[PDB]
Design a protein around this nucleic acid. Structure first.
Ligand SMILES: c1ccc([P+](c2ccccc2)(c2ccccc2)c2ccccc2)cc1
Ligand SMILES: c1ccc([P+](c2ccccc2)(c2ccccc2)c2ccccc2)cc1
Lengths: 275, 275
DNA sequence: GACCCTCCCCTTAGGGGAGGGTC
DNA sequence: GACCCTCCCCTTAGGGGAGGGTC
């Protein structure tokens, strides 16, 4: 025999008035009585129990329309409904976990590039391996490589990492080049930021790595003159100390910013493994 | 010197055409050139790099508008941006973890009620404790208790569990009542499905529990006649075997369904601890 | 004076067409 | 014949008012 106005229900069940009017229009939760003259909504006490399901399902993210079918299932079916919710949550969990790990890897590589000792100077450090996915360069060289060239690689990596690669790589035979027009890339590649199985990789792609070891490295902001100059520094560094190269030259490029406004600028790093 | 149509960009960066037009209108990613006669959009190769940030941020859920400010920050600021993303992810994680645990508890109590041996029959089982939050009943009894009476309790429990309580409880002194109008509740309560700290609980509420021990129990679907009949069975069961009661009578009620259409029906369970 | 009601506008990220040009 | 363009409608869950009755 006790009835409540929309405001009272709102204060009692901690649900906004607008939400009550909406659930009314949606036919999810309608007032027991509507005054035909004022259109005022009135609710009964026993009815409040229905807001328990609605609030709990809202808390777990169930869409309103699906709530309508939830209040129609039996306690047994509701049990299963929750089982399904757990499955989805475990699915959300590992997605966030993987993402949490990926982000951490990105920051690690990001910091490493911000902590670089100096630009335009050859350094010899002990590197850890870098997992990559590569494909033959098809005759492409430093002057004609395009972002579009990495299209097939990015698709695969995006399908397993989600976080699209930010670094673009290429490799070439270590030679005493006297001109850029003399060099041709062997492979182009993109590092993989995840260990998630890849969805049926075609044979024209190879999963491999930049092996851990001692590397002669040099980093700098790209410019045609810098590219040539720094490559020659690397070559001279190796000849001067008669070092022995045991891998191709690895070239990684990463933009310094992604602003469509500012003049584009890229960071380049060349590495060559030595005995 | 190489340019692409919207379709080509779509196939290259795996982004829908509609999305490209939208990012164009939003001024997040605009084509390098727009044909003044056909309005056809054309993109340059160097521009594709900007879709890397956009896609990665979309993958982590960053809203488009905030992406515009992300492509304006420095590599240092971007590093921090990710730090903030990790913080939010860890926040999402424990929320899902807690929810995963709560759901499991709900299913456990839900199953227990579906596996009940029989209705209207007294059983003596060894119960595990049930954490609850209670408040004095203020003279309320079986005939005048309302859903609204639990308003203050539900607010607090909802503030810590999120999953609003589904079970409503009450307690009363074990007496040889000959009529319902003779009984008055001592406390009304609602179990807590979480161990999450409660936000400043007022003193008119008490956090306590239904202690683990041996309980004389009985469950049934509510009806005025059943309520009285089953209470008398409990009283007789205890007197017949001269059992000693060491707690008040606990009364838990949970709806059998939350359909606003079907006739309401509730499941009731009475429990009294014995030495 | 508080409370309640009914429109009306608005948010986010595009998808699914319809009608008509354009590679 | 495929590709591309410009509207137009639509989704989800209400929030924030404006104008005017109603406790
Ligand atoms: C005493 C108790 C309840 C109502 P009524 C109501 C009146 C006429 C027709 C149907 C219902 C009500 C109506 C408008 C404002 C206040 C009270 C009423 C009864 C049960 C549930 C809701 C409303 C009136 C007097
Ligand atoms: C040869 C190479 C590029 C173009 P255009 C272009 C034409 C006129 C004015 C500005 C741009 C082009 C336009 C419409 C359809 C196809 C090609 C062109 C150039 C750079 C980037 C995008 C488009 C035309 C001939």
């Amino acid at each position: 025999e006790s009835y409540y106005s929309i405001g009272e229900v709102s204060k009692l069940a901690n649900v906004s008035i607008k939400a009550l009017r909406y659930y009314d229009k949606i036919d999810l939760f309608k007032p027991a009585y509507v005054d035909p003259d004022t259109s005022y909504r009135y609710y009964t006490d026993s009815q409040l129990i229905h807001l328990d399901l609605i609030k709990s399902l809202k808390y777990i993210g169930t869409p309103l329309e699906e709530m309508k079918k939830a209040q129609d299932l039996e306690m047994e079916e509701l049990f299963a409904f929750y089982t399904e919710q757990e499955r989805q949550i475990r699915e959300k969990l590992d997605f966030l976990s993987a993402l949490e790990q990926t982000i951490s890897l990105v920051k690690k590589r990001m910091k490493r590039q911000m902590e670089y000792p100096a630009l335009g100077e050859v350094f010899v450090l002990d590197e850890e391996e870098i997992r990559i996915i590569q494909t033959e360069a098809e005759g492409i060289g430093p002057e004609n490589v395009l972002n579009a060239s990495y299209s097939k690689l990015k698709k695969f990596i995006e399908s397993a990492d989600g976080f699209t690669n930010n670094s673009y790589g290429a490799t070439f035979s270590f030679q005493p080049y006297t001109s850029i027009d003399e060099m041709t890339y062997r492979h182009i590649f993109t590092p993989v930021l995840t260990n998630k199985q890849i969805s049926s990789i075609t044979p024209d792609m190879e999963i491999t790595t930049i092996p851990k070891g001692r590397y002669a490295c040099i980093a700098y902001n790209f410019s045609p003159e810098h590219y040539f100059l720094n490559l020659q520094k690397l070559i001279k560094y190796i000849a001067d100390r008669q070092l022995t190269v045991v891998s191709d030259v690895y070239e990684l490029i990463i933009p310094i910013h992604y602003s469509p406004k500012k003049q584009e600028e890229y960071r380049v790093e060349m590495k060559i493994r030595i005995a």
